[model samples]
Target chain A: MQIFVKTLTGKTITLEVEPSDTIENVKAKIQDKEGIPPDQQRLIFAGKQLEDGRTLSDYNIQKESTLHLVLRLR
Target chain B: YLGGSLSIYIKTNTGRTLSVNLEPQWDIKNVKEIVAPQLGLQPEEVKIIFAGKELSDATTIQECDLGQQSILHAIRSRHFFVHCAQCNKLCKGKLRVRCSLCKGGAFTVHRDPECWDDVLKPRRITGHCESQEIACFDNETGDPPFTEFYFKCGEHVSGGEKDFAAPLNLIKINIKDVPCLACTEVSETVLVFPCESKHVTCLECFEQYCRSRLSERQFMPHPDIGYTLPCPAGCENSFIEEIHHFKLLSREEYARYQRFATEEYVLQAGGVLCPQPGCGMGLLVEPECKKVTCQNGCGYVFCRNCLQGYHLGDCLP
Candidate 1:
């Protein structure tokens, strides 16, 4: 599934997610776009527990869902 | 000698259950009594047991299905930790001195505590910080101690305001007069130059800094560029450029700032102003009316459009 992501300061990028793709996979895509580290990333799902091993299909995430990542200047 | 077996199970506050077999050296009766306070259960309620099927006074971890390392539960709280950027240490709200040798922004004692403010000042001759920990200008032997140096992301300037930042001197200037353009009270600070030089700015009307007779197009040092560059507003085809000897107006500036403050207050207070000049415009400062009519002997009906003077016309008119 495709989704738009936002940084804590409101910069944004788009990425594709897959059941086979780990959070690290999505992070690599974002790193290519923003030139930042994945360690600074955070995900916010709509009032639900995001199981680490769960897939996009299992969690019922939709396209264009927004995720927030915060990176400090350090 | 009457003997069976003894086991003690302890659930930690963090939700981990610790089970230990009490050897014959330990009194099983004493273990039961000690566990009552921790488990919040009566001693009588706990029936000592041997095997799962048969009830007996003696029980040991070796006989139960649970092993010594069986996890009772996960104990965690997110707020218990905080990321310390300086030390790169995750700690529980405790003060710790960070290792200053980290990459970028941390090299300067100015941003860091030990060498920033108290001990020293920047060099008058070399302009280098004195802190021995950081090399300011690639001159190690010439290093000065106890001065300010810029940290990470510190090399850029907002506009015309100039100061020492890491690897650069930056100047930042801004356009504050724009929003106050229409209001005459705002006119005091609105960047309207009196002479052709226009360089002599009103301290009150135009918000400016580093009033220099130096040519505006001059190139600045890279490190200090942040404090040297005039605002890019002119490059973007906006804003007027003043000449030199530009001074900010004190009295007039305060008046304009005060006017903005009043406007902000009334706008926030559901768009209301004081009818009396000396008093809060009370009912007079209403959202619908752009003009303020004073009812008291202070009898001052001020025009919102012309902040300096007043209007005498009735609201019905």
Candidate 2:
């Protein structure tokens, strides 16, 4: 499925994904777009925020579901 | 997916940049990560400037790339400066940014003899408040590292412009003791743009606006130099602008905003559903008055009076 990524600064990007991708893979993708690190990355789908330990399989995401990635500062 | 030919460039903290042709898939991180390590700093330390913007870590490759013509140059963090969010005045500060969306601008205080001799931690931080963290400020650029360390739990949105995620961690507070730069209101303690200016807007008037509003034109009062738009529901009250905007967005929040906005431009128009579900709001345009309307079963004429929607359900009375 194709997905779009945007930074909080209003910059935008588009990407195509496969079901085999991992959250780590998504981290690599985000690091490419923004300077955020993999460990520091966080993903939110639907209404629930997912941890880095899970993957697309765990999330049960579909072929074209869009997700948001923001920096997780504590 | 199709638009302008892919291009790439390198930006430095000091605003120096080099642009060149490159694969659309390649990002500045690939370049900066590889280059900054050689420069004796982490990739985060050496900001990758691109497309006329100096991105800390908020910029991504899809937006631009490091083309063959792109040049890589190292910049000292000190070169970039902005106002210190803590002191609420012009104080040069610079450092690796914390995530504004996730961290929520909440900080814990601890004492150390290294940074400062002795100083009380300011107000509105998370955990403890005792030491002299000083909230590192970029002496040259006047940028603050951690404005507020904690954020109220919620979704964040700033400006309607396409963004990767909302700034959820960062917070801006006003210092009423400090005089206002724009007006003489003693209570002008709100987050304003253009860190250089001391004009503080209050909560009643201040919203999570983009830093772009700082710059202005001859007649029209455009928002700052950046894209100055209001914050969305989750991010309301939390001001997002400049580098602080993208600082702490989680990968998910960032991608959500990006993908949603992009899909919006690519999808079909009008024939859309009513934002108010079960309301059967469809997109409709009428050429007579050039007004769009949403015909509710109640015979209420809900037209896109000002062309906000694609003439979507605004004229259906």
Candidate 3:
């Protein structure tokens, strides 16, 4: 499955993954692409912070699902 | 049925290990489920840390190199009370780091010892803090380490920064003051770089470093290298960006640096500087135009192709 991530700076990136992949795994990929640290990146899906421990399937995330990226300033 | 069962040992913070039999196909979630009941906690509440990485539920034990005696750590969220020195408020939750300089010792307490002392004195630190300790300043360069350690606890005012992490250990107060790593001088007026390392130096040292770079002719930013001012500790991507630091350079040096910068910029942008001897201003002329005028106060009109005064019919070079 592919997830579309939209940064607060209007940068849209697409990440490829499996349903079994965890949110942490997705965050790692986003860090590589966006230059934002995984810990500093706040992934919001459905008005919630994505749980790193859970799998993408647990959140019912589908292909082409858009996840909003919010960078934590610190 | 999953193939073969392997004996795996899972450790806790308290130095106890649980031996579990697991199949190769069983993932970390399965391991957490098996260990959670023994710890009197739910699987979701258990965080498995293996090989220095926090394992996700979807990760497989085989992928993590689990063998007959592979050990993993299980951590549970526990509440701890943290005391803030600035506000004298006791806040709940983990206090990430207890700044080494905050605690007190024996002997008289007349004046506050410099914080960098702990960093420099390798003999002072004992136990866990010693393992993660680094030199206060780079030995070869005599420059302070290019990383800032922020001691903060959840907006209670231990220190101010964008984000705060929970302390690794128990509660303690933060440094009452920030000190300059260069001159052993103490001041709140410090400059932090935008680099990921967050290396900090005092404003005074910042100016000194800038002036040194300008005198060394290293102040001009390189296109490929990307920076003139760099962190003293030599951390990658660390560079000085403060505007006021440039004011420290002499006017002559600054002007020369500006010319070098302008030349690079114009060339990179597909423009050219006037070929006139005294005039060095950049010109953006049409690709086919032979005649170019110096608009940069030189007022010298020249032929681009012949490199001489603008000619009606060019025959002499």
Instruction: Give stretches of model 2 more than 4 Å off.
Output: A1-23, A27-74, B1-173, B179-184, B208-317
Better of 2 and 3 by TM-score: 3
What would the per-residue lDDT of candidate 2 be over residues B1-317, giving only the tens digit for each residue? 44434443443333334454544555556756665655456766654422223544434555432222333334534311223222222222222112222321112233212231332222222232111333333344453332221111112211111111222112244433653333545452344444333345443333222222322211111123122233422233333333233222334433343333322321222222233334432332323444333332223333444423454544453
- List RMSD in Å for every model shown: 27.3, 22.0, 21.0
lDDT of 1 by residue, B192-240 (tens): 3332333323233233333231224232222211112233222322222
Off by over 4 Å in 3: A1-74, B1-188, B215-228, B240-245, B248-263, B275-278, B287-290, B296-299, B303-317
Candidate 2: which docking quality band? incorrect
* Number of clashing residue pairs, candidate 2: 86
Write the residue-wise lDDT of candidate 3 on A1-74 in tens digits.
46687643335688988655788999999889757656766565533456789766545454455666544323
lDDT of 3 at B7: 65
- The TM-score between candidate 1 and the true structure equals 0.18
DockQ of each: 0.02, 0.04, 0.03
List the candidates ranked by lDDT, beginning with the highest: 3, 2, 1
